[PDB]
Ligand binder design. Structure first.
Ligand SMILES: NCCC[C@H](N)CC(=O)NCCC[C@H](N)CC(=O)NCCC[C@H](N)CC(=O)N[C@@H]1[C@H](O)[C@@H](OC(N)=O)[C@@H](CO)O[C@H]1NC1=N[C@@H]2C(=O)NC[C@@H](O)[C@H]2N1
Length: 155
RNA sequence: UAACUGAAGAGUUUGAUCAUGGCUCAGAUUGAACGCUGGCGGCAGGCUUAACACAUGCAAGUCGAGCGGGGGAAGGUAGC
């Protein structure tokens, strides 16, 4: 299980006499062969925040059906004001994406992809959109099963 | 055989936050200019502004097998 730390931020809460500071961490875990998840953690210190984020990421996982080491088809997804577009690429291309998309894709095991963000680039929302797109991407076997055809018929 | 295959973001409004939205940055390119410095070769390029005014030299001649004249050099014969 490879673990990646997308972002760490300091947040404040106002009380009488001053401010209480805390830290938030966003993490993505993945096996690298089709299983990936993400989570967030809040704590008064960075190590505890990262630990909580990793535990939440392990509790929130999905399974992704890749075509080799790339996507099955182009994907459009969005969460809130963040929109993402991902497209399969040939061998040797690599992962052409921003940091937030790159964490999720590398954790899921995608090796060749072209990706783009439109709208807001907030890390949590971008991770949400990429996660949803990867979850909703389909495969020829599922398409054939749902249509009642064969894979060769589907083409 | 081959004639293409292609898309990354970041900073900044607030005590935190998300969104909106400008401004700024990372790239490629140039008939460039300026500052510091400067060994060689190959191949290119070189008034983007005053279609402003121009000294001087050169950048369109050739034909005597179209024609009549006119020149000045070599020869020969005759006298001395
Ligand atoms: N919001 C607070 C509302 C407060 C409001 N005052 C309440 C009120 O007044 N009346 C109550 C009326 C409630 C209404 N009838 C039901 C309703 O809201 N239906 C719509 C919401 C569906 C559902 N409920 C929420 C949901 O499934 N979220 C998931 C979730 O976050 C996460 O997936 C998981 N599994 O964790 C993520 C992937 O990471 O995908 C999100 N999905 C999505 N993201 C996308 C996005 O944004 N756009 C486009 C599309 O793609 C979206 N789908």
């Amino acid at each position: 299980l490879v673990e990646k730390l997308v972002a760490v931020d300091r947040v404040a809460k106002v009380v009488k006499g001053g401010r209480i500071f805390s830290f938030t961490a966003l993490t993505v875990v993945g096996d690298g062969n089709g299983r990936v998840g993400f989570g967030r953690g809040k704590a008064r210190e960075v190590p505890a925040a990262i630990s909580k984020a990793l535990e939440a990421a392990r509790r929130n996982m999905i399974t992704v059906d890749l075509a080799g080491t790339t996507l099955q088809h182009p994907v459009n997804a969005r969460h809130g004001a963040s929109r993402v577009y991902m497209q399969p690429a040939s061998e040797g291309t690599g992962v052409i994406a921003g940091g937030a998309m790159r964490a999720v894709l590398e954790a899921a095991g995608v090796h060749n992809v072209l990706a783009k963000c439109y709208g807001s680039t907030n890390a949590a929302n971008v991770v949400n959109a990429t996660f949803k797109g990867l979850r909703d991407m389909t495969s020829p076997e599922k398409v054939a099963a749902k249509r009642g055809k064969s894979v060769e018929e589907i083409q």
